[PDB]
Every structure is written in structure tokens, then in C-alpha cells.
Write a protein that binds this DNA or RNA. Sequence first.
DNA 1: CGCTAGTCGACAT
DNA 2: TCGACTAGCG
Length: 348
Amino acid sequence: GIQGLLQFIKEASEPIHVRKYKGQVVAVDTYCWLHKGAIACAEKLAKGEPTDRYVGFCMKFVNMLLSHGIKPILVFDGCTLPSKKEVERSRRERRQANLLKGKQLLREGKVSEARECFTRSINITHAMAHKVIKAARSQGVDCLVAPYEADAQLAYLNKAGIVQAIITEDSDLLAFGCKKVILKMDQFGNGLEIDQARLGMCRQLGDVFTEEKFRYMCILSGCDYLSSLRGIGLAKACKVLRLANNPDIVKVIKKIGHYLKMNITVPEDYINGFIRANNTFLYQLVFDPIKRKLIPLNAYEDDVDPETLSYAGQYVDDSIALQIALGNKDINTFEQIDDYNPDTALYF
DNA sequence: CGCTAGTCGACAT
DNA sequence: TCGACTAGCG
Ligand code: NA
């Protein structure tokens, strides 16, 4: 995600405990729990051997949140966004290597170094995620599989008032316009919360605490959607936005060499890349739990054209979207693997 | 100072 | 995966 964002705005953070959300609703990026739980049993998962330690690992977190009187909404990743469809695969292959290498590193005796090999080959499948989903439903905990990336979905759940805070390890949530993000939370409840409103507590941030400018900064610094121009980090991007008296971001990016007083040349496809990135942060498709409909993260502004935003996710039928969201329909094969019905007993 | 890429540890015995 | 941390260079 946004490389080095947390340290950049550490002044806006605060050590908290989950009890401050007792009697309120919190959405969870379940992937972090799934991964941290999968580390404990990477060996069995790599060899294909049966294991389910990650289920219990997630469930102790769930039971903790429930013990402190909090209503958790588990959120999962869905279809891979086209913008990263290569990237993920570019990661995928590497995992395979760390499998083929890893096992061979066990043939040389080095099990200590094979640890890092098998732990860097972990692939969180939809099956494992669904096992966790069943394990959560058995405890009466609502779940929700995002149409695509879970970040946008969580951001929506928080900006809609459905949840008050979001538990995750990804800082990208901030660039999506999240209000309250709880980072680094152990199995006991000790966490680190960052609020959007308190982004002004960061001196080096300047006046770049507004959501739009902050987003521009995050994108310009380098993200999953668009690699940053070489030599551009959070600081110099922030400086560009501070020295800019211009609302139109395109002309500003074209004048980056003027704002940084450097010889920076901007490729004309990088402009389009920035536009696509911004449109992805703004209008990535998410699922509305209440209205049961595929909607963009934010309402389409008048200046944008929804017909040209396929890279931000494609629309499907709202019923199918519902079946995906409930985790009944497989992300890949589009086949029914379950039949949960919330009616016959999040979705008001 | 600031940015890149690269290593490194996570879990837990 | 994803942040943390650092050497190396503009
Ligand atoms: Na960068």
C-alpha cells in the first residue's frame, strides 16, 4: 500500500483500547487476521496438508471483540481489481517459488531458513476465508465479502455510519477517506487509532489534511494503483500540494518540476495513470448492505463519466452481487457453494 | 534533510 | 502480506 504512511502521520495517532467502542459497531479487514493466523501453520498449507489453526486464530479475536461488547462486521476481499490483476499474479508466481524452493530448503536440512521460505509463500484462498465465515456465522457474527478490494468496502461501511471504526493493518484505508482506523491490535484489545479529523495534528503535513489533497498526496507518493515518479515520496508530494494554489490537479502535476524546483519530466501517460488511480480511490465499486445494491464508494460527481471507469470494477446484477457478498457464490467459478439466507432467522 | 530498494519479522514455542 | 528498519545516494 502507501509505503511509509504511518510513520509520516504518527502524530495523529493514539494508543487506545477497544472498550471505547463498547456497544458500537466495528468493521474488520479479516485478511490481516487470516494471514497472521496462517503464519502459524504455513507448513501444512504449503504441502496441502489439512489444517484450520487460522480459523481459531481469527475466532479468538472475534470472541475478544464480542467479550468487550462490540459488534464486529467481518469483511473479506473479493474479485481482484483489473488494475492489479497483473501485480497479484506477479506476486502469485513468487509464492510458488517460495514453495518449490522452500521444500527443497528442507532437503538441505535448513528448516530454520525454510521458515521464512514457507511463511513468504502463504496464499489466503477463498476456501479458508469461507471456513472463517462459517465459523463466524456460527457465533452470530455478520460477514460481508466485498465486490472487490476490502479497503473500499470498509471505507464505505465507515463513511455510511454503519460502523464507527475499522480494524486493519493497511494504512490505505486513510486514503479512502476513513474516519477512524484502528491499527496494530493484538488479541487482547491493545490498539493504535488514527482519526481523520486529527490529521491536522501533523505539522509536516501542512494544510494537506483535507481528504482530497491527502488522497492526491498518497497517490503521488506511490500506491498499488500507480507507481510514483522516481524521487517522489510522501514529503515532496506534500510539499508540492502545499506550494500549490491551484485546484486543478492536472496542471499542478504538469508543473511538479516548478513546485519542487527540479528538472522533473512527466510522461503523458502518467497523467492518465493518476486520473485512473484517483478515480479508483473515489469510485471503486462496493456493496451496500442496506439497499442491497452495487454502488461506487462515493457518489459519481458531475465531472466524471461512469462509462469509462471499468478499471474501478465492473457492475453485475444486484442479486448476484448479494450472493457474492454473502459468500454463497464463488469469486472465481461463480458457482453456489453455500445457501445462507439472512431473512429466515447487518441487512436491515 | 528525503527517497529508494532491500532485508526482516510476523506466529509462538 | 505489510509495516519496520536501514544502508546508500540525491
Ligand atoms: Na515513492
